[PDB]
Amino acid sequence: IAKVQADEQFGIWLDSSSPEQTVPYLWSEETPATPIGQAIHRLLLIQAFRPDRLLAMAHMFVSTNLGESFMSIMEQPLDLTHIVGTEVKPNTPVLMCSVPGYDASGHVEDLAAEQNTQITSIAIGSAEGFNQADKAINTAVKSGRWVMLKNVHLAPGWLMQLEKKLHSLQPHACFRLFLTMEINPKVPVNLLRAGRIFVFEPPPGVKANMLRTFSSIPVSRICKSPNERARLYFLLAWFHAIIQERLRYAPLGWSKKYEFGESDLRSACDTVDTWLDDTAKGRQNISPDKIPWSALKTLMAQSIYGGRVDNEFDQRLLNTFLERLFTTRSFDSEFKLACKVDGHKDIQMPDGIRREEFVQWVELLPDTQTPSWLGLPNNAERVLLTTQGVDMISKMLKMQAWMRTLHTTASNWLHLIPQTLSHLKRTVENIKDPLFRFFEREVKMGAKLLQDVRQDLADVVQVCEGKKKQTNYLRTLINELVKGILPRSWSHYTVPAGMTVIQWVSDFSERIKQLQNISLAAASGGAKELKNIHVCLGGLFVPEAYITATRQYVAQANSWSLEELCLEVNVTTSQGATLDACSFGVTGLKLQGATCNNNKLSLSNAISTALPLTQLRWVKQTNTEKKASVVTLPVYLNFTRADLIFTVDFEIATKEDPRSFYERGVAVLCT
Amino acid sequence: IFTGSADIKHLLPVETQRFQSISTEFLALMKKVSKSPLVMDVLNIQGVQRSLERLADLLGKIQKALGEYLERERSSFPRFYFVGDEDLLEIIGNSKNVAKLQKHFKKMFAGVSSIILNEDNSVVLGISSREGEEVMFKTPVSITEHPKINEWLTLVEKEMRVTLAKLLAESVTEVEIFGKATSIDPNTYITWIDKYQAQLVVLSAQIAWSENVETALSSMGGGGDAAPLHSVLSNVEVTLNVLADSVLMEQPPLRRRKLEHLITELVHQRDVTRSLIKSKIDNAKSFEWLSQMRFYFDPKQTDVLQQLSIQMANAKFNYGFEYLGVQDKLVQTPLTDRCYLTMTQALEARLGGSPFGPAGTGKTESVKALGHQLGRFVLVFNCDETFDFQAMGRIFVGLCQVGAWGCFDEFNRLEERMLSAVSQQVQCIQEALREHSNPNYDKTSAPITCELLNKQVKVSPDMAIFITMNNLPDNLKKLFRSLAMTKPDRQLIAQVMLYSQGFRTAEVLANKIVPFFKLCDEQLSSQSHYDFGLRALKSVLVSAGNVKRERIQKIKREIAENLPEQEILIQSVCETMVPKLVAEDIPLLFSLLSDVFPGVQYHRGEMTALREELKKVCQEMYLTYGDGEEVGGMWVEKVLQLYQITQINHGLMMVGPSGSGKSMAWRVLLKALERLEGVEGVAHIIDPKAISKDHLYGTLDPNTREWTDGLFTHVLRKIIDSVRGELQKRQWIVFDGDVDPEWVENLNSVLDDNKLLTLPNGERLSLPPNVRIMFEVQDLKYATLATVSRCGMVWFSEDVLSTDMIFNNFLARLRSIPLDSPMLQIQRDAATIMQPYFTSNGLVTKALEHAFQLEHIMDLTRLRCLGSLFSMLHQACRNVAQYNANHPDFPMQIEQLERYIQRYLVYAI
Ligand SMILES: Nc1ncnc2c1ncn2[C@@H]1O[C@H](COP(=O)(O)OP(=O)(O)OP(=O)(O)O)[C@@H](O)[C@H]1O
Ligand SMILES: Nc1ncnc2c1ncn2[C@@H]1O[C@H](COP(=O)(O)OP(=O)(O)O)[C@@H](O)[C@H]1O
């Protein structure tokens, strides 16, 4: 504390691009330490300050411990000619596993071409392919040639049979068997153990993705028909690259992990071809305003790239991208593919007519690709790096007498978790309040789950000293506790995926404290005080039920119908600001990607701008069209944007536009 | 095979002769064996093994010959692939009698369920749908001229398509006159609607609207100047007004269905033209109009399949002209429009359709609606363990041959190996479809074929495979275009359906009824039998329409647009939902109704006609009856609800915790119906778990092939045969006991609209209209949703049967039924003595309430302890009688009896 407070370059260090390069000497040690100890202490500091650079600091620690350039060989291209020559016996197959959406046959075909050894490449999709591959491997091992088997993940049982067959002595030593396949769990374990696995991934980057897309499409297709076809294909390639690179930032940018594979690109290319042929009967160039822009946009927003989109907000984002790119303005020299890039720089549209110019412009793209190219905020990279570091820590934990530590952990949890909250509810008078019924259900569910958890933890404690017998349910529960996975019988409400038991019990303790406060408020005055409670949606097991109860209460007061009530959201500065007859205070809402001032949104680089107090007002609908200066922001439950609670209408500042809010993934979170 | 039919000899004569020789030798051998049944004696007969092997190989060869004949019959008439091998054997063998043929026509054709023949069954005059709609062939086909089954069935199919084409031409000729006019006369419009089939009427309306809009756009080439699109919209509004006026009156059910289909399609057309086309659109080639499903009619074309072309975006389809009868028409919501666009785009690129999404959003229904829109036969393969290889392979072959559609309800429900094999078959078929559109091989000279059933099968270009999900197998990822169908547009489906029902405030009613069902799904407790999905909403809407029409008829027999439509809607909601609600959820339901429908109240039906026979029967059975708030009000309400769902549908299910008034409710209802309607009621109480499934339904002898009926099947057959006259009498098959997905498998085809029990031997039992199948179960915890959804339900919560009711019944039986006149006097004296303790807050009630709090070795049930108490009080009365017998002089006095009963009551408690 004193070390960080006294230092005055510490603040500028926190904001440095690479804090891991120059970590200030903060730890207090009586004796000088070895460089490895310095690396450990700096790694701890990086984990504390700026955890996004944890991967880079881990790289530096690996360099200081195992020597510099330990990982340098991995960065070099895989020269597997040496690996297929030596280090691989003919008995062991060479497995070429690729990430879904990538092909590995190119490298092996090229090495065969340079090593002038033919390969009997065979697709395993058909049933006759089984016999064809059997004959090919028999002949190639008798003679001494090479054999290929592409997409073998489609035949798991046949893969196991192949593994059994190869186990016999293989007479020839120049024989090599390649199994090109996709990374799927259906592959047999024995085949994986018996062969050399090679993992191939598509290189990240918009430039690499667009180069791959342009190489995949034959030159004849692009250089054909009106010359506008080349520019249309370039636009399609750029759109595909943008929506595929936005996938790596799964929570912020695409909500879920959609496929968006090669099939969608081929379908979009076919649609572009057919519609450009239909609109342009002749080979002559057609006016850019005569392009069927509406047809392409609709078919690439509702059938292609849109069929797999389920929630409305990702569809809105896709429509924003399509309406920004596929327009007649794209054929002008002033078109900007991406704006605001790196603050002031812009990705200017190339001025070309043919495929060669577009490919050259792609090859001239700078390597410094920030997430602002995709439209995402530049802090998305930092968030992703933090998540990857957390995943690395989790893996190291997963790859690392238990009675004492489990006993002390369970005792600490019992001290942490509140003892018991009682059902103080079910009053005949004033049952008409929907808030009363909703809080009744919440209190009952919370008390039931609390009793179950406390009884199970007490059972675990008693078995830790061996004061009682152990049963099957208890064995499963204790196994999941020691392994760190939350018990399935404990998850009665919505929980973020992969939530640690410690986080689960802390969140449960907070929820139980909130429910106890609710019960105390109900006992003190009745159901009138239930209205004037600043409940937090995150603590509530089902916040949507709370919103529904709010709507029902505001209807029952003044005797309206639920159809006529619309939600008006006003964010007040005071955490305890006075409520009117319709406003219910809601705390804990966190706004990502923007800051609200006087109910007006403005874009910000900082993430998770906490909302002081949210006032949910249900006013009678006046049947008016919302102005173009408001945005419909989703309100998800947790940081994993998988559950939608409700939507909020916020007015934005006059400088920004709603499209930028849509494409930057601005959303509200309950937790 | 060879003796249950007479036409088998003509189809397979030489094989018939070989089988006759084989049977002669076999009968001789069996006669030889019978004279010496000893095993050693049988083995020692000369050459038993040689002749036996000869018979075996001859039977095998003739069996492959019969299989080859069946395969050639399938190949000649492709629709035979849908029916089974035994079904095909029955079809070909029973060709002479068409009565046995009509039970298969619902499997081969789409809407055809029977055929209209001559007086002598010589010429096929026409076809008839399941709902009674009939299509008369323009040129009837003759069976005598084409006696072979396949050729005359093919002639029937071709003449069906030609007749549909001609009827469509005539209907379009009429509807172009109707469209190009204003202030349509209701009489001529209704006559036109009655003249043509529902499919034809809807198709003609679509064609007329599409041509009108195309002409309007063509005449608007310059721009908005002289715009006739407003004229098209006005015409659509006039037609909708005429239809809305027509549906308010009393119409035949068929014309009612046609009217509501027309209303749905005209509403969709009005929505399309009003906004999607009137937003400054003036070019016929603009995608705002090309995106919409356009119909183009060219009657000049000779070929029937080429007359009508259906186009959406860049995909062009030819109408298959398959007869569909009267199918339910989905409301074309924007989600349905997106589904049509995506599926048509997938079909144009020769891909498949995989509309994934949560169950109940209409994926399968949308696929079926699209298939029916193009006039294609659509088959739905349910994957809820009613699945099989032997039918599915030949079904795929048939889909490839005839050119029909195939949709899987939920592919992920398939088991792993079954899923992999079906994915392999679908991959083969879809690869054939992909090669059918090779850019270099667009002019398909050699036929495009696929490897199904280890043989070459021609693939029709018009077929398609749709795989509804809830992910796709790795084989079909690159062959199927997915589509997210997650949130159906219920606020528009409800609005359009309410408008078609005749409601004049459909929009407000939908905006109230959709959030109300969302609240019911959310606010109400979670129960297995609760169903607040889209199907339940549609059923409630049609019930509300029926209620409104009934109210209109009642008011007329005593314009009329002043009805409280909200009151009718909530009355329908209550009548549909309250019977299946737990007693804890009823106040919640009414609170939700007050929240959404403010100030609109629900009044039940008085039913004072039956509510007096109920009182009489309860009085003569020592029960307790009361109206509403009085004691026993909830029980009589449950009885009346049971009567309501009895009237509504067959296949009842009375569910409730053990101890509620379930058996007494339906017993009293049966007796009251017998005394009121004059129809004698007979109830067969069957415990399904007491006997095995084979004993419950019957067993087929593995060797003798002799069928003996089971308990339920024997009961149904006896009720059907009418040897004694059990018709004109109310028969109730009450299935007292527990329900599981095992013994109700054969009952699923009976509970639904089929009312059809199919026996393993082949015999088919039809449920008479006077028989109801009641399920008196306790928890409904191990019952599949298929059985629950097929059955109307009344929930008997324990709060229905109060403790005072039990006490009153016990005291009445004590005062009336002798525990064997002096005994009756002793019983009456004891009842008078112990009456004060059996009150609302008496000693017994307080003691019972306290005793629930204690710990018992077995789960304490109210009726168990109450029955033990009643039995021990009966024994106290018996002891008093025995003491009186032991003392003929000076019997038990009133003071001594009072003391003895007062102390014995505490002892027994
Ligand atoms: N008005 C009444 N209606 C029905 N039952 C009554 C009434 N008054 C008293 N009773 C008593 O309540 C009991 C009703 O039992 P019933 O046969 O209806 O239950 P059940 O649901 O079929 O039984 P279970 O499912 O527990 O086997 C009987 O003991 C009956 O005598
Ligand atoms: N657009 C629609 N218009 C009218 N009814 C619909 C629509 N979509 C779904 N439904 C109704 O929803 C019910 C269930 O849909 P279903 O197709 O069974 O869902 P799933 O595809 O999950 O099986 C059907 O009875 C159907 O009438």
PDB file of C-alpha atoms in Angstrom, chain A residues 18 37 40 48 54 115 170 176 240 244 269 294 327 416 441 459 547 560 568 576 583 585 620 634 641:
ATOM      1  CA  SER A  18       3.349  -2.795 -22.250  1.00  0.00           C
ATOM      2  CA  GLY A  37      12.506 -14.769  -8.464  1.00  0.00           C
ATOM      3  CA  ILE A  40       7.910 -14.425 -10.328  1.00  0.00           C
ATOM      4  CA  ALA A  48      -2.469  -7.590  -9.803  1.00  0.00           C
ATOM      5  CA  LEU A  54      -0.471 -11.653 -17.980  1.00  0.00           C
ATOM      6  CA  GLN A 115       9.424 -34.699 -52.278  1.00  0.00           C
ATOM      7  CA  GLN A 170       4.014 -52.721 -41.806  1.00  0.00           C
ATOM      8  CA  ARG A 176       3.398 -42.741 -44.492  1.00  0.00           C
ATOM      9  CA  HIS A 240     -17.015 -12.067 -44.177  1.00  0.00           C
ATOM     10  CA  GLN A 244     -15.460 -13.786 -38.676  1.00  0.00           C
ATOM     11  CA  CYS A 269     -21.165 -15.565 -53.567  1.00  0.00           C
ATOM     12  CA  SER A 294     -31.805  -4.333 -51.504  1.00  0.00           C
ATOM     13  CA  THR A 327     -24.749   0.400 -50.587  1.00  0.00           C
ATOM     14  CA  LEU A 416     -19.695 -16.974   5.371  1.00  0.00           C
ATOM     15  CA  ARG A 441     -41.671 -16.902  -4.209  1.00  0.00           C
ATOM     16  CA  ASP A 459     -22.781 -33.408   6.034  1.00  0.00           C
ATOM     17  CA  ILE A 547     -40.048  -6.690 -13.941  1.00  0.00           C
ATOM     18  CA  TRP A 560     -54.578   0.153 -15.918  1.00  0.00           C
ATOM     19  CA  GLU A 568     -39.253   4.346 -18.953  1.00  0.00           C
ATOM     20  CA  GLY A 576     -31.341   6.541  -2.396  1.00  0.00           C
ATOM     21  CA  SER A 583     -40.448   4.281 -10.111  1.00  0.00           C
ATOM     22  CA  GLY A 585     -35.150   1.704  -7.653  1.00  0.00           C
ATOM     23  CA  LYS A 620     -49.133   4.681 -19.908  1.00  0.00           C
ATOM     24  CA  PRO A 634     -30.352  -4.991 -24.096  1.00  0.00           C
ATOM     25  CA  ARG A 641     -24.473 -12.340 -22.901  1.00  0.00           C
TER      26      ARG A 641
END
